[PDB]
Amino acid sequence: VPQTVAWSAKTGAVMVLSNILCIVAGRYVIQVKSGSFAGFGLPELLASTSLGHIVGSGAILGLSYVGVL
Amino acid sequence: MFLISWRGYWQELIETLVWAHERTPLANLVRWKDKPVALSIVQARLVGLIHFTAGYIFTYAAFVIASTTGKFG
Amino acid sequence: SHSVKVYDTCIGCTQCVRACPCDVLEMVSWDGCKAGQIASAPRTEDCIGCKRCETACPTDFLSVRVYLGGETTRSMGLAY
Amino acid sequence: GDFLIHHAIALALHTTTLILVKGALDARGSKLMPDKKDFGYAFPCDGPGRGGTCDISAWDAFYLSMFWMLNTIG
Amino acid sequence: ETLNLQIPSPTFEGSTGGWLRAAEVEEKYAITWTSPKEQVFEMPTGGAAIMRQGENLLYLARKEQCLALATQVKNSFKITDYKVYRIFPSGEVQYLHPKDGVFPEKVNAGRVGVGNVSHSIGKNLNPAQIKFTSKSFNG
Amino acid sequence: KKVSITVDRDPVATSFEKWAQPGHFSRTLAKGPKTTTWIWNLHADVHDFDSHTNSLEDISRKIFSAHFGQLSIIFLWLSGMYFHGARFSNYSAWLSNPTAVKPSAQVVWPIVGQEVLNGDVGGGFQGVQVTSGFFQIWRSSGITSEVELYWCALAGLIMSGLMIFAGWFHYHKAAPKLEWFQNAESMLNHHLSGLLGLGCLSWAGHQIHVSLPVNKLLDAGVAPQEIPLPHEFLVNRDLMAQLYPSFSKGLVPFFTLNWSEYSDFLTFKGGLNPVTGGLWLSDTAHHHLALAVLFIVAGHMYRTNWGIGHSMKEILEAHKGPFTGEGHKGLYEILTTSWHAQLAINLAMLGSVSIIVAHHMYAMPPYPYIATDYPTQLSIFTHHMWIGGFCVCGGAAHAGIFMVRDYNPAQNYNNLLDRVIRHRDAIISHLNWICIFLGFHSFGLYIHNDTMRALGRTQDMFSDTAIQLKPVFAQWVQSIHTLAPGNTTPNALATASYAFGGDVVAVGNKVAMMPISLGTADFMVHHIHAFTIHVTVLILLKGVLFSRNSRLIPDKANLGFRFPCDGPGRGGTCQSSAWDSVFLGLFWMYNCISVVIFHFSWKMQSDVWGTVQSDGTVTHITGGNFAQSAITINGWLRDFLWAQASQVIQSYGSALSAYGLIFLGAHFIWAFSLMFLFSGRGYWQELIESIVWAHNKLNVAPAIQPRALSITQGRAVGLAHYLLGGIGTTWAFFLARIISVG
Amino acid sequence: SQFIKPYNDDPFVGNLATPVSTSSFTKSLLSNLPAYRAGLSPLLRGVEIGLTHGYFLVGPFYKLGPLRNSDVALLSGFFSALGLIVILVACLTIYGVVSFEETEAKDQLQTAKGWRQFTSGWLVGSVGGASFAYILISNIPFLQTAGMSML
Amino acid sequence: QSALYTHHQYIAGFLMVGAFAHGAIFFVRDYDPEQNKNNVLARILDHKEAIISHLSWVSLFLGFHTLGIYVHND
Ligand code: CLA
Ligand code: CLA
Ligand code: CLA
Ligand code: CLA
Ligand code: CLA
Ligand code: CLA
């Protein structure tokens, strides 16, 4: 079984990082919608944090698997 | 096959085979003298009837001879 | 070729000619029916024998009558 | 068992005769094709008109009764 | 009257359903028509082509292939300007349809009736009567 | 907000007036019958909605309400299976002793001596043995009571009432407009996220909270009435944490992403449960939870009302390369304006999924005690092969209907359809060649082996003892799947299926699953499969590609999808329609699926199923005769059909005598079909003329003039009786054989 | 960029110019092959095709034939190949007789004289190629085995 | 004994079917109604529907009952 850990500030760091990474990515790549103050709506934010949680969870589970944590 | 499947299906198969033979290199050097057509409606009824009948005769002749020979009684 | 005949019970409805996919039939003047016209077959060499003309015939017994005969490349519907 | 099979053979001889007799008597014509004689003994059909005329020739009743002959001799 | 061989053809990306060696060795059929538009039609031999505005020329292997396009062009695009020709490998061009300038469904003077039988179909002779004699079954 | 709900209110009046006027839906049939053909033409075109109406809106409304009617019928059917399990079954007796009691949920009335069909299935019970696998489903659900089966029957009854109400409501009270139905992005988002995703999520939740505790208690050995009721696991988290100690921490490990705490009940074990011979339900719970996450994530792909998402039109129009012209341009317009194009795709996929279901369910038995219930394993494999094959041929049927009717060349210039129709001779000629090559090189190997074995030349055969056609690629893939646990699936503990290699899993001394070795006989029968699938594809594809026109008939689209012929000319154009290729390909589907189920039945009896003796020897049902006898046709005739038809023929006077009766009845129906298949309409119309004369003579002629069936209907009736007769023969033979011996 | 075009710049001909049908590699191979090679006599065309076909016919008859396990397997395989050559050369002869009307010109296969020259070359080449295969397999032990001589 | 009986019964069924086939060929090709006015042959054709419908009846009669008794027994 892959080794996962209880929540720590490092897990929080990975989630926060992945979320911000996806906010910036969503500002660049979402085709239908002041770098972040132009056309930034709730759907765009909600979609990017949805992916940020998907990417963050995948990253946390993988970095816990390999030992990086 | 001759009694259930009928001509239009087979003529459309044969026209794709005619296309393929004419378009295949090293094979289009050889040409038919008679245009390949599907069997006729009456001809295929006869061919299926002959195959049905021959299968009927050969199956029963094999059974009536082998069952009696093998059993002897 | 096939042999296509038109009998004098033809009412000149022009439907068999319209049905013809191969321009076998045409209309000629005839005083026998009320329409003043009867079907004719001057091109039975192009007749494929589809018998669509027979289906379109509204007479009790088809005035247009296809009799399948000798086969040719044209009457066999061969594009090869 | 002999009684039942003899009646089965009676059905088979009568049914093969029905198909063959229907072919012979309707060989020269029928309501579906009155001028059947003009087309011969073995022709495919008269086309899809008048509802459909597959196996309308007298040869085709030979064809259909050949199965019933095989079934009865079976 | 004669087929102008230089008529441009419809834009077809080609197909495998077109004509084979019998077209260049036995007979080929051609159909021409005038279109008011640059419009897509369906080929009898396959997919879709675009007929050009102005005059179009087609090469088909069958007269029914030509008349199938003729009906598609008359019922969907209302072209009544179609002429169907049979082109021999010799280079002879035979005009076919409409044969005398008027459609077969319309009466025309100078048409002689071929195949017309003076009696009804039930007055045909029985085959036994016409057996072993050259006399025809249509009376 | 361009995705919106729009409905016409009170479109159609709920009146019995059109019920009283049969044929109301079409202009041809509404003027009443004059011949008996009208009667047949009534049923033949009833569900052909796009033949009655021009508007896509009324067509879509009729389809939506007919889907609710179908769902109502399925829910009524399910409610009946639950009620027959509750009331007329030995389910409670089967729960106590799953390996000895035979499932039975059907009891016959004593009328004409037919009460012999209430055989001794076990558990102090008499009834018809049932093979649908419902008992194994219910044990997997954790039902453990007939009261809960009554509550499931009522839940099915309530759903059946709600679906028949919803069909009435959505046709007669609030029918959606066409712009509602043409929301493929919204529908896909909801059917991936909502239907499949919350379906898996809710089912995984049920498995974790109900199936897992109840089935752990059942496999521990606790009697069904000693097991706590399924809500007592929901409340008493302490009692649930006894069985799975991870429940002591609750949902904190889920949200904090500490998911390895849940490894007690979300496993990746693989293999089978040794006690039941079924899949580990902890694996099934993890499986459904993982599918739920991806299905919900997938249902966020498409753009609906907020700018995020894909336009499927943009995805399709961007995929074009140098070989394929304009590419997938125009396919979105097709699939949102043609129902038949959607039904062609979805029927081919539903049939493919049903075929996948049959292979995966036998190989990886998913229910407790289903693997060693061999009548159920054979029944559900054979059933889902037939549902798969039928649905695949209906995918080609509605591909033909799309091509004849909904295809417009103007909107399909130089796209993928245009290019396929423009090289259909190359496609059909290459498919024709591969089918000839593969009939020669699969069935001709059988003819070679028949000939050599008949000639005394056993050294000249294709066999394991002679020339060995080994399936090296299939054996190699089996090697990889046996080596996969710990190597390429490192966290797996066992193989995905024991069919690939590994242990023999035995439950109640009967083999649950065991390695299926592949030899020369398996090479030969798999190439038989590849051949029969290829030929069925050739007939169905030749019908789709040549549905609109040929070199033979250049105007085939004007004759329609379903026409009998275009006359005896051009040599004869009998069966030239796309319908007649569906008709001819349903025979070859029958041929294909019959060989697949024969291969499965013989191979599983010969090499998988049987009893485990002391020292782990497995005495198989037919004693390993597949390897040396499935290489000849005489072996299939002798060692499979003749040897195993013993049970149907000798079933009279027992509980399996119904199978002997259906065996004979289906031989009758199959033969009776050949009257419609080998004959033509003109014979029967002239015979009917003589019968009409006999009626006229007695002044008893009907006013609805009797006609022989149409040419197409004679073909359809022949095919329907042929399929019923063949499949019913195989159904009776399979079921009496495996109920007696397995 | 489109890699498929109408064949011979004629849209209504029943062919499509495709990479497989009309690449330079395909055109080079067909022209290089003896049947379509320019400058090649019909007899020489038959000799090259025959040498090829007779050479590879021996191997299936030898390796998979009824007498394969016998020491006379190669002789049986050669004789079976030779018998097949004689049947095929009869087929070539009868096709030539019916298909082509007698004409003076012999420079093409599609002529009565040219197909007779082709059949003559094919027989000589096929018997020679079959013989060459027999000589090579007899001399080389590795060819006598199926490649398992190293094993 | 089995081969001889089976052989000659199959020859019998072929000859009997062929007899009716050539009666159909006779009607199509060699039968002249004017030369055969009100004969046994013309009057057989005159009631062709009585003959065929009564063969249909007896075939159906026997088939329904013989099969029904057999199915009853099964
Ligand atoms: C949907 C699946 C399904 C299936 C296949 C069956 C099948 C069966 N059930 Mg089960 N059943 C079901 C659902 C199902 N049931 C449901 C949902 C319930 C709960 C209400 C029950 C409750 C139930 C009980 C309580 C019993 C059965 C019994 C039976 C058996 C005989 C029934 C019988 O002869 O009725 C025949 C009854 C008639 C009235 C004859 C029908 C004749 C009419 C004309 C039908 C025509 C329909 C009509 C024409 C349609 C048009 C409507 C009209 C407006 C035109 C049979 C095995 C019996 C059994 O197993 O005994 C051991 C039994 O006692 N069933
Ligand atoms: C997330 C929402 C959602 C869900 C669950 C469904 C579900 C379904 N739709 Mg879809 N649909 C949706 C949104 C949704 N749709 C939207 C937004 C549109 C507009 C674009 C459509 C347009 C549409 C069409 C046009 C069609 C469907 C069809 C279907 C049915 C497919 C057959 C099947 O597998 O049913 C069996 C599976 C089931 C689960 C049956 C349950 C039935 C209910 C309705 C499911 C949901 C119940 C409820 C939400 C659950 C509450 C849980 C509670 C106990 C806690 C299925 C009931 C087809 C059909 O059969 O029509 C009836 C059809 O033709 N739908
Ligand atoms: C989701 C599945 C689905 C759907 C919605 C449709 C819907 C449709 N199909 Mg498609 N089709 C399907 C599956 C489907 N079919 C499959 C699986 C096949 C392969 C067999 C076909 C093959 C097919 C063809 C070949 C044709 C259609 C046609 C039609 C249309 C009208 C049919 C009609 O009125 O029949 C009304 C219903 C009947 C007449 C029922 C009779 C069918 C059998 C004989 C009854 C079965 C009885 C029972 C199962 C077994 C007998 C038991 C016995 C012991 C009592 C309609 C658009 C036809 C059409 O009009 O095209 C537009 C058409 O030509 N389809
Ligand atoms: C057992 C009966 C039988 C047999 C042998 C065949 C044979 C064939 N069918 Mg038919 N078919 C049958 C029943 C049968 N069918 C029935 C009942 C139906 C009902 C609907 C159909 C409907 C049907 C359709 C609709 C299609 C076929 C197709 C095919 C061909 C498949 C290609 C192939 O395998 O070539 C290999 C040939 C064989 C397997 C025949 C057996 C030959 C064996 C191997 C030995 C050869 C003997 C050898 C020549 C001896 C020579 C010496 C001798 C001449 C003296 C092939 C010609 C397809 C086709 O033609 O396209 C490819 C096709 O599309 N069939
Ligand atoms: C009650 C009505 C009725 C009557 C009086 C007849 C009368 C006759 N039929 Mg029958 N016939 C009928 C209905 C009827 N037919 C129907 C509905 C069919 C279609 C299945 C047929 C099919 C049929 C065939 C195929 C044959 C006859 C033959 C005959 C003749 C011989 C008598 C015989 O053996 O019957 C035999 C009867 C049957 C084989 C079928 C019986 C059909 C059912 C039982 C009757 C229908 C009941 C009807 C619905 C009553 C509704 C009225 C109600 C509303 C008040 C005789 C002229 C035979 C003939 O020509 O021989 C001289 C023959 O070969 N008929
Ligand atoms: C088992 C196979 C089989 C069977 C039963 C039949 C049956 C029949 N054939 Mg056919 N035939 C077959 C194979 C078969 N044929 C084949 C392979 C061929 C070769 C093409 C032919 C060619 C052929 C021709 C050319 C002729 C016949 C004729 C007949 C009839 C002869 C017996 C008779 O007159 O009354 C016997 C009647 C029966 C056996 C019918 C059974 C009664 C049914 C089953 C009642 C059951 C009702 C039940 C409730 C239905 C449930 C349906 C469910 C959906 C609700 C009968 C309809 C002749 C005919 O029509 O003469 C009048 C005729 O002209 N047949």
Ligand SMILES: CC1=CCCC(C)(C)[C@H]1/C=C/C(C)=C/C=C/C(C)=C/C=C/C=C(C)/C=C/C=C(C)/C=C/C1=C(C)CCCC1(C)C
């Ligand atoms: C279709 C067709 C069209 C027109 C031309 C056509 C070719 C002519 C025609 C074909 C017609 C065909 C094919 C006709 C076929 C006709 C057949 C097969 C007629 C069979 C006749 C057998 C009889 C009368 C047996 C009589 C036995 C008796 C009396 C025994 C008596 C007894 C004795 C002596 C000893 C035992 C005691 C008893 C029982 C008392």
Ligand SMILES: CC1=C(C/C=C(\C)CCC[C@H](C)CCC[C@H](C)CCCC(C)C)C(=O)c2ccccc2C1=O
């Ligand atoms: C027997 C037969 C007929 C005659 C069959 C008819 C007229 C069907 C009439 C049967 C009775 C009248 C009704 C059938 C009822 C059955 C007892 C069960 C039917 C079940 C569904 C119809 C509901 C044809 O018309 C035909 C046409 C083309 C090819 C082959 C054939 C063919 O074989």
Ligand code: SF4
């Ligand atoms: S259809 Fe019959 S009637 Fe009308 S014109 Fe042609 S022939 Fe004369």
Ligand code: SF4
């Ligand atoms: S048969 Fe077809 S082609 Fe010949 S005439 Fe009648 S319609 Fe025209």
Ligand code: SF4
């Ligand atoms: S289907 Fe019946 S009618 Fe149409 S052609 Fe073939 S035989 Fe003649």
